[PDB]
Structures are given as C-alpha cells and as structure tokens.
Design a protein around this ligand. Structure first.
Ligand code: CLA
Ligand code: CLA
Ligand code: CLA
Ligand code: CLA
Ligand code: CLA
Ligand code: CLA
Ligand code: CLA
Ligand code: CLA
Ligand SMILES: CC(=CC=C/C(C)=C/C=C/C=C(C)/C=C/C=C(C)/C=C/C1=C(C)CCCC1(C)C)/C=C/C1=C(C)CCCC1(C)C
Ligand SMILES: CC1=C(/C=C/C(C)=C/C=C/C(C)=C\C=C\C=C(C)\C=C\C=C(C)\C=C\C2=C(C)CCCC2(C)C)C(C)(C)CCC1
Ligand SMILES: CCCCCCCCCCCCO[C@H]1O[C@H](CO)[C@@H](O[C@H]2O[C@H](CO)[C@@H](O)[C@H](O)[C@H]2O)[C@H](O)[C@H]1O
Lengths: 166, 95, 154, 164
C-alpha cells in the first residue's frame, strides 16, 4: 500500500518489443513502393528459394520457425524476472549495469538511460511508436485498398469508393 | 469366440485363495474375536487394520487357480473317477 | 449445414414463411391510401421486414423445420460470430461496467466522513474513472491478479 | 512440466529421487526389450528370410485341443506370476542397516541414506533415462497413430501437420 506504481520491468519492457517489432513489421511493406509493383497480403511464402524443390508444401513452415522463436523467447523470460542478457540494452537498456534506479523498486515517472557512445533509446523512442500505430494504420486501410501516391493528374484527391462494407 | 471359462477359471482363481485356513493352525474365524458381544469400545469406532499382512500364501496357494483351473476345466474334470455309480452317477463328458 | 438445414441459399420452409405470413400483410385488398399520405403497412413494416428478400444479408444461418433459423456457433463451416463476436462484446462491455464498479467505489472510504457519498454521485457515472475500461489494455488481466487486489487484500 | 521444480520429501522427493526413476529404470529396460522388439527392422538389409506371426499354429499344437484358444492366453497367464518373483524381493528392503523392525534409527549425522541404491554417483543413468522416456512417450507417436503401413519413403520434404 502501495500508494502507487510500481510496475516496472513491467511493461516498459512491455513496449520496446512492440516498438521494435512494429518497426520491423513495416520493413515488411517497405519493398513494393519505389521500383514498386509487388505485394499486399501477397501471402508470401515468402521470398522463396531455389528451383530444386518445394512444391506448394514441403512444410508447415511457418508453423516450425516459431517453435524456435519459442525457446529463444523463454530465454528473454529467462531474463526479466532475474536480469540476465549480457548487452543488457532492453531490460532498462545497456550502459552495462545501470538504469536500475528502477530495478530495485521506486519509480513514479523514471525516464531511463543507455548508449555508451552515446545517446539513447529515445529517438528510438519515437520511431518506436511511429511504426506501432502505423501498423494500426497499415492493416487499417487494407479492409479497402492497397497503394500510395502518384502525382497531380488525378490520384491523390480521393475520387469515389464504397463505404466501409457497409 | 469368448473365453467364457477364460474368467470363471479366473474368479475362482481368487476365492480358493479362499480355501485358506478352515484347516491350518487353530479354530474358525481366528475364533470369533469380536463379532457377537461387541468390541472394546473400540469406540470411535474402530479397529483393526494392517497394511502388514498380505503374505502367508501369496506364494503357496497362488497355485489354487491352476488346480481345478488346469486339468479340471478345459481338460475334462476328473477323468479318474469310478467310486459307486449305479443309483446312477455319470456324470458324462458334455465336452 | 449442421443439424437443421442449410442457410438462405436454399430453405423451402423458410421461403413459405416469407410469403404467407407476411404478405398477408396483404389481406387488405385496399384500405384506403390510393395516394394517401399516412397508413404505412403499405411501405416497409413489410418491405423493411420484406425487401429482406431472398437476401437477409446471407449470414449462412441454419434454419430447421418451419425454417425459423437456429444458432449453432461451434466455430466451423460458417457460424462463429453468433456468440463469440457478440460474446467477447458482452464481456468487454460489462467488466467495463464493473471495472468501474470496483472504481467509483474503491476511490472512497477515506479523507473525512465518507458514509453515503453514494446516494448522490461524486462524478456522474464516475466521469473520471470513466474510460478506465477502454483504457483497459490488459489491466485486471494482470494488475487484478498481481498487486492491489493482491492476495494480501485477498 | 511435472518436473517443473516441485516436491518435498517422502511424497515429493522420497517417492522419486531414485525410487520411482529407479523403477523408471525398468521402463527403460522395458524399452530395451521393446527397443529389442522394434529393431526387427531395427536394421534395413539383412534377411529374416522370414517368430509367431498373424496366427498360423502356435508352438507345437499340443496332442489335444489347444487349452483355451490362441497363442496369447497360454504365454500370457504365466508371465504375471513368474515375475511377481522379483517385485516381492524388490519390495522388501530399507536403506541403512537391516535387522528386523529394530530399536531406533531415524537421524543423527550421515542423514538416513539415499535411495538404498542411490546415484552412488554416475549421474549418467538418468541423463540417458529421461532421454529414453522422452523417446518412448515422444516421437514414438510417429508410430502410434495411423501406422497401418510401414517403411516406404519416396522424396519430397518432411512433416504433415494436423489431420486425419
Ligand atoms: C458495481 C457492481 C457490482 C459488482 C461488481 C457486482 C458483482 C457481483 N455480484 Mg452483485 N449486485 C449489485 C452490484 C454489483 N455486483 C447490485 C446493485 C445488486 C442488487 C442488490 C447486486 C445483487 C447481487 C446478488 C443477489 C448476487 C450478486 C452477486 C455478484 C457476484 C456475481 C456476479 C453476478 O453474476 O451478478 C450479476 C450482477 C448483478 C445481478 C448486479 C446488478 C447491479 C449492477 C447492474 C450494478 C451496475 C453498476 C451500478 C449502476 C453502480 C453505479 C456506478 C457508479 C460508479 C456511479 C459478483 C461479485 C452474486 C454473488 O454473491 O456471487 C459471487 C449474487 O447472486 N449481486
Ligand atoms: C531484420 C529484418 C527486416 C529486414 C531488414 C528485412 C528486409 C527485407 N525483407 Mg523482410 N521480413 C521481416 C523483417 C525484415 N525484412 C519480417 C519480420 C517478416 C515477416 C513478415 C518479413 C517478411 C518478408 C517477406 C515475405 C519478404 C521480405 C522481403 C524482404 C526483402 C525485400 C525484397 C528483396 O528481395 O530485397 C531487395 C534486395 C536488394 C539486395 C536491393 C538491391 C541492391 C543490391 C545491389 C544489393 C528485404 C531484404 C521480400 C524478400 O524478397 O525476402 C528477402 C519478401 O519476400 N520480408
Ligand atoms: C544458471 C543459469 C541459467 C540462467 C542464467 C537461468 C535464468 C533463468 N531461468 Mg533457468 N534454467 C537453467 C539454467 C539457467 N537459468 C537450467 C539449467 C534449467 C534446467 C531446468 C533451468 C530451468 C528453468 C525453469 C523451469 C525456469 C527457469 C527460469 C529462469 C528465469 C527465472 C529465474 C529463475 O526461475 O530461477 C530460479 C530461482 C531459484 C531460487 C531456484 C530455486 C532452487 C531450488 C533449490 C528451490 C531466469 C531468466 C524460469 C523462467 O524463466 O520462466 C518464465 C522458469 O521457467 N529456468
Ligand atoms: C490498441 C488497441 C485497441 C484495442 C484494445 C483493440 C481491440 C480489438 N480490435 Mg482493434 N484497432 C485499434 C486499436 C485497438 N483495437 C486501432 C487503433 C485500429 C486502427 C488504428 C484498429 C483496427 C481494427 C480492425 C480492422 C479490427 C480490429 C479488431 C479488434 C478486435 C479483435 C478481436 C475481435 O474479434 O473484436 C471484437 C469486437 C469488438 C470488441 C467491437 C469493438 C470494435 C473495435 C474496437 C474493433 C479487438 C477487440 C478486429 C475485429 O474484428 O473487431 C470487430 C478488426 O476488425 N481493430
Ligand atoms: C471472426 C471470426 C472467425 C473469423 C473470421 C476469425 C478470424 C480470425 N481469427 Mg478467430 N476464432 C473464431 C472465429 C473467427 N476467427 C472462433 C469461433 C474462435 C474460438 C475457437 C476463434 C479463436 C481464435 C484465436 C485463438 C485466434 C484467432 C485469430 C483470428 C485471426 C485474427 C483475427 C483478428 O482480427 O485479430 C484479433 C485478435 C486479437 C485482437 C487478439 C487475439 C488473442 C489471442 C483472424 C484471421 C488469431 C490467429 O489466427 O492467430 C493468433 C488467434 O489465434 N481466432
Ligand atoms: C503384477 C506384477 C506385480 C505383482 C507387480 C507389483 C509391483 N510393482 Mg510392478 N510392473 C509389472 C507387473 C507387476 N508388478 C509390469 C508388467 C510392469 C511393466 C511393472 C512396472 C512397474 C513399475 C515402474 C513399478 C512397479 C512397481 C511395483 C510395486 C509397487 C509392486 C510390488 C513400483 C515399484 C514401480 O517402480 N511396477
Ligand atoms: C554389481 C556390480 C558391480 C559392477 C559390475 C560395478 C561396476 C562399476 N562400478 Mg561399482 N560397486 C558395486 C558393484 C559393482 N560395480 C558395489 C557392490 C559397490 C558397493 C559395494 C560399488 C560401489 C562403486 C563405487 C563408489 C563406484 C563404482 C564405480 C563403478 C564403475 C567403474 C567402472 C570402470 O572402472 O570403468 C570406467 C563400474 C562400471 C565408480 C563410479 O564412479 O560409478 C558411479 C564408483 O563410483 N562402484
Ligand atoms: C518426442 C518429441 C519431440 C521432441 C523432444 C523432438 C526433438 C527433436 N526433433 Mg522432432 N518432431 C516431433 C516431436 C519431437 N521432436 C513431432 C511430433 C514431429 C512431427 C512428426 C517431429 C518432426 C521432426 C523433424 C523433421 C525433425 C525433427 C528433428 C528433431 C530434433 C531437432 C534437431 C536436433 O536435435 O539438433 C541436433 C540433433 C530434436 C531431437 C529434426 C531431426 O530429427 O533431424 C532429421 C528434424 O528436423 N523432428
Ligand atoms: C452490455 C450488455 C448489456 C446489458 C444489460 C444488462 C447488464 C442487464 C443487467 C441487469 C441487471 C439486473 C436486472 C440485476 C438485477 C438484480 C436482482 C434481480 C437482484 C435481486 C435480489 C437481490 C438484490 C439479492 C438477493 C435477493 C433478490 C433476488 C431480491 C449487452 C449488450 C449486448 C447485447 C445488446 C446483446 C449482444 C451482446 C452485447 C452487444 C454485449
Ligand atoms: C469456450 C466456451 C466455453 C467454455 C466454458 C468454460 C470451461 C467455462 C468455465 C469457466 C470458468 C471457470 C469461469 C471461471 C473463472 C474464474 C474466475 C475467478 C473468474 C473471475 C473473476 C473475477 C473475479 C472477475 C471479476 C470482475 C471483473 C473482471 C469485472 C468487474 C469486477 C468484477 C468483480 C466484475 C463456454 C462454456 C462458455 C461455451 C462454449 C464457449
Ligand atoms: C505469465 C502468466 C502467469 C504465469 C504464472 C505461472 C503459473 C502457471 C501455472 C503453472 C503451474 C502448473 O500447475 C497446474 O498445471 C495444470 C493445472 O494448472 C495441471 O497439470 C498439467 O500440467 C502439469 C504440469 O505442471 C502436469 O500436471 C501435467 O502436464 C498436467 O496434469 C495441474 O492441474 C496443476 O498443477
């Protein structure tokens, strides 16, 4: 009691993983936009290697990878109850040892730290969201569309479309 | 198809594990201990139990099964008879 | 598809319902509105239950005998959001009724004499603890089971 | 996840520290008998040429109608009486000194003992034990579902998803 927070560990690490995976997610799109032509779901497969065999299937693929992702992920667990990850640049950041002016508890607002040379996990702050909410954006607009920006002939001006579905 | 006598073989597997002790030490019923008349009183109540007495013939009369159950079941029960048959007797192999 | 029959794409019994029944609705050869501007069976009430033609959307929707439509919702063939879609919805809405129940409540028992502040209402609906509910991402799904309402307080 | 760290003593530990896994040593040697069974293929390439297969006429038919019917009941019935030999002996022990139900021997120093037959070191039986258990229970279900067929791989990939 515990007046108030708290937390900590917690879901600040909560974010960064959103941040830095929403960032990647959008590398996803990056591709089909300059020398353009090729994407949406495009339910890839996803880049697809050689002419020496697959063939629709050989295998669930997809389904596996992430059995792997799976114990590597127990590993990041395998970190955050009890701080273990050499670099140590998510759990507070690196700059070895430190930040944990919030690892033993007592925050309220606590801003943080972590580049030796140099600066921060900060203006990696705000690419941090630009991209989470971007996705929000990204697989917002499909559910009707899939492409950006030509010139001033007759595109960027929104002409006629078709509700929501309804 | 059914081993019917697969299992009646089987059940007096166990109650001959019954033929037991009417014979061997002393009287009946480890003599009526407690039956009629009525326990001390006892009283909560009450005893006894003993995780420690599942031996005695585990080994010996675990044969009892194979008795009747062998030669006296599927192999035509006592062929070695005769012993007063004329008001009749026999008896005669339904098998 | 399952125990009853198939949807709307065909459902004979269902069809007959459309038709007699409503349309008898009709039933009134006239009954006067040759041009007249009130008596609205005429327009919709039928057509709003009616132009609901061989379309209702299309919804799958199973329809047994007499062809009144039955709800499976076992998450299969088509029928999933006849419980879950409007199920999580019932959950999310409530719980953000009582998340705030356990809120324009756990905000009082303190300061000075707090003995019925509640027969009047301090912030109406709470209008402060209000959005705490949509401003539940995760929320009680962690902080209920860890800390605050913490087993301690259990 | 049953060995997800949990257990105290006579129940918790006591039941298992070697005891149950020392009884799970049997499991492994059963799966040494069973992995003395499966190796019928076990190897590619050698003959059988051609062992009790699909019931043609048992051991030697007997001079008289076979007791019940089938090879199964005659070889079976016995197995579960002639092996109760071992478990009788295996369930009469105690770990420290052996006398009867003697005076008083609970704990000073030396602390009781350890599974009677402990690790005695060689913590390598267990490293192979759960290795075997994990197999028997595990991808042994590669051959525990719909294995009406046998060995005939023909080039493609690997795996097949959820099915059937
Ligand atoms: C905010 C409120 C609140 C909350 C979180 C609960 C929670 C609970 N009630 Mg409950 N209850 C309430 C108000 C509330 N009640 C009221 C006002 C009454 C009328 C006396 C009851 C009568 C009642 C009974 C008879 C039972 C419960 C039971 C329960 C428990 C079972 C849930 C259930 O299925 O009943 C569903 C909930 C109701 C029937 C309550 C109806 C009232 C709701 C709609 C309150 C809505 C908020 C209200 C307008 C407050 C104003 C907001 C303010 C911040 C400005 C659960 C702990 C059961 C129990 O004890 O088992 C654990 C038991 O059967 N309640
Ligand atoms: C760490 C990673 C991050 C980065 C940097 C990339 C980078 C890339 N991804 Mg990608 N991706 C990511 C995370 C990332 N991804 C994630 C999390 C997913 C899952 C959604 C995907 C799913 C995905 C798919 C389905 C595909 C890509 C593709 C690509 C490539 C674009 C097409 C190409 O051939 O390049 C152009 C290559 C050049 C070399 C530029 C030309 C310059 C020369 C001279 C050098 C590009 C290499 C496409 C690809 O082809 O895979 C590699 C496409 O198949 N990604
Ligand atoms: C020294 C080594 C190495 C390191 C750095 C870690 C680190 C970690 N392990 Mg771990 N682990 C290791 C070897 C290691 N492990 C090995 C060899 C095993 C074999 C089982 C495990 C089995 C294991 C399990 C099952 C779990 C962890 C978990 C964890 C994480 C939580 C800390 C904990 O539960 O301690 C335990 C603290 C104790 C005081 C142990 C009590 C000792 C007995 C006597 C009581 C933490 C990141 C947990 C986790 O991350 O889950 C999300 C939990 O899942 N580990
Ligand atoms: C950060 C969170 C916030 C939260 C908690 C949610 C939560 C949800 N969104 Mg969502 N969304 C958000 C922001 C959020 N969204 C934003 C910012 C965008 C655009 C930037 C979207 C665009 C979006 C789409 C396109 C869809 C969702 C859907 C969903 C729901 C998926 C599960 C379901 O079957 O819905 C149960 C439905 C409800 C509880 C009705 C509420 C309607 C909204 C919240 C959705 C879930 C309730 C999906 C869905 O099917 O919902 C109908 C899907 O349609 N969202
Ligand atoms: C709307 C219905 C029907 C349809 C069209 C879908 C569509 C989908 N389901 Mg889904 N589902 C259904 C019925 C349906 N489901 C039923 C009846 C069940 C219960 C058996 C589920 C249980 C379920 C799970 C458990 C999951 C989905 C997932 C999904 C995908 C994510 C959807 C989404 O917008 O994210 C909204 C999702 C969230 C907002 C959070 C999900 C929380 C876990 C999506 C393609 C997800 C998926 O495919 O991979 C994760 C997820 O796996 N569904
Ligand atoms: C019947 C026969 C009898 C009388 C017993 C009797 C016993 N078994 Mg046993 N067992 C048997 C067949 C039998 N088992 C077979 C066919 C298998 C295989 C096992 C595998 C087995 C295990 C793993 C264990 C026992 C154990 C035990 C003891 C507890 C008890 C003395 C426990 C000692 C335990 O360790 N048995
Ligand atoms: C019935 C068995 C017999 C057999 C075949 C063995 C065999 C073995 N014992 Mg052993 N041992 C036995 C009875 C036996 N012991 C008895 C009765 C005792 C107590 C009387 C011991 C107490 C004992 C100890 C302390 C050790 C061995 C060790 C060893 C291993 C060393 C092997 C080696 O030199 O190659 C390589 C070996 C295979 C050594 C070992 O480290 O194993 C865990 C050592 O620990 N034994
Ligand atoms: C018993 C269970 C469980 C466990 C513990 C494992 C464990 C393992 N599997 Mg596996 N597997 C399982 C269930 C399991 N599998 C199921 C249900 C399937 C579907 C039938 C597979 C299909 C599968 C394939 C195709 C492969 C593995 C492989 C492997 C090995 C990974 C490579 C390696 O070991 O590196 C160093 C050794 C590993 C020992 C890899 C392997 O065995 O090499 C051919 C191979 O990729 N598994
Ligand atoms: C949100 C909601 C709601 C509601 C509603 C509600 C939420 C209602 C409730 C109500 C309540 C009540 C009504 C209560 C009552 C109470 C009582 C009745 C009590 C009684 C008593 C007591 C008090 C105790 C004991 C005694 C007696 C018994 C007397 C939902 C919505 C929806 C819909 C439409 C449908 C679909 C889904 C959704 C979309 C989601
Ligand atoms: C899938 C599905 C299913 C399943 C089911 C089941 C299995 C159930 C059970 C269930 C259960 C088992 C439940 C329970 C739980 C537990 C608990 C424990 C809960 C809770 C809680 C709480 C406590 C809450 C609270 C609250 C909230 C959150 C809101 C506000 C405040 C209050 C109070 C209200 C069903 C059937 C539906 C049908 C089909 C679908
Ligand atoms: C991150 C979210 C919070 C996570 C906190 C960690 C707690 C998670 C619970 C794990 C404790 C497991 O305990 C509980 O497992 C299952 C029931 O819950 C059941 O058990 C089941 O899996 C157990 C492994 O643990 C084994 O018993 C068997 O696999 C199966 O029976 C038991 O009923 C119970 O012992």
């Amino acid at each position: 009691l515990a007046e108030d927070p708290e937390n900590l560990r917690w879901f600040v690490q909560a974010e960064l993983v959103n941040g830095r995976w929403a960032m990647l997610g959008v590398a996803g799109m990056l591709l089909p936009e300059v020398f353009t032509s090729i994407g949406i779901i495009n339910v890839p497969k996803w880049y697809a290697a050689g002419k020496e065999e697959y063939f629709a299937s050989s295998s669930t693929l997809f389904v596996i990878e992430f059995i792997l992702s799976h114990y590597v992920e127990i590993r990041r667990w395998q970190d955050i109850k009890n701080p273990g990850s050499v670099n140590q640049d998510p759990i507070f950041k690196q700059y070895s040892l430190p930040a944990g002016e919030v690892g033993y508890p007592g925050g309220i607002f606590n801003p943080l730290n972590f580049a030796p040379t140099l600066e921060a996990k900060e203006k990696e702050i705000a690419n941090g969201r630009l991209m989470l909410a971007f996705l929000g954006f990204i697989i917002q607009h499909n559910v009707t569309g899939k492409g950006p920006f030509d010139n001033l002939l007759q595109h960027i001006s929104d002409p006629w479309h078709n509700t929501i579905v309804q | 198809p059914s081993l019917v006598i697969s299992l009646s073989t089987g059940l007096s597997l166990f109650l001959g594990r019954f033929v037991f002790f009417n014979f061997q030490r002393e009287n009946m019923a480890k003599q009526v201990p407690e039956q009629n008349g009525m326990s001390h009183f006892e009283a909560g109540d009450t005893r006894a139990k003993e995780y420690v007495s599942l031996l005695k013939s585990n080994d010996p009369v675990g044969f009892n099964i194979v008795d009747v159950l062998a030669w006296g079941s599927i192999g035509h029960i006592v062929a070695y008879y005769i012993l007063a048959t004329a008001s009749n007797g026999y008896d005669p192999s339904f098998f | 598809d399952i125990a009853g029959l198939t949807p709307c794409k065909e459902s004979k019994q269902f069809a007959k319902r459309e038709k007699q029944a409503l349309k008898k609705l009709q039933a009134s050869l006239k009954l006067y509105a040759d041009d007249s501007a009130p008596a609205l069976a005429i327009k919709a009430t039928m057509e709003k239950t009616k132009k609901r033609f061989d379309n209702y959307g299309k919804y799958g929707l199973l329809c047994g005998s007499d062809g009144l439509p039955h709800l499976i919702v076992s998450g299969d063939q088509r029928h999933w959001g006849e419980f879950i879609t409007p199920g999580i919805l019932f959950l999310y809405i409530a719980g953000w009724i009582g998340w705030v129940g356990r809120s324009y409540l756990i905000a009082i028992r303190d300061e000075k004499k707090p003995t019925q502040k509640e027969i009047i209402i301090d912030v109406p609906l709470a209008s402060s603890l209000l959005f705490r509910g949509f401003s539940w991402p995760v929320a009680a799904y962690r902080e209920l089971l860890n800390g605050e309402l913490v087993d301690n307080n259990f | 996840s049953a060995p997800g760290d949990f257990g105290f003593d006579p129940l918790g530990l006591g039941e298992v520290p070697a005891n149950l896994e020392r009884y799970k040593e049997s499991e492994l040697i059963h799966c040494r008998w069973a992995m003395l069974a499966v190796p019928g293929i076990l190897v590619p390439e050698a003959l059988g040429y051609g062992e009790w297969a699909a019931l043609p006429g048992g051991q030697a038919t007997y001079l008289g109608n076979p007791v019940p019917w089938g090879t199964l009941p005659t070889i079976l019935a016995i197995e579960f009486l002639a092996i109760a030999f071992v478990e009788h002996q295996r369930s009469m022990e105690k770990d420290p000194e052996k006398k009867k139900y003697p005076g008083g021997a609970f704990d000073p120093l030396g602390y009781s003992k350890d599974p009677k037959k402990l690790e005695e070191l060689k913590v390598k039986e267990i490293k192979n034990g759960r290795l075997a258990l994990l197999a028997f229970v595990g991808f042994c279900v590669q051959q525990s579902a719909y294995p009406g067929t046998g060995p005939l791989e023909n080039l493609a990939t690997h795996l097949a998803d959820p099915w059937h």
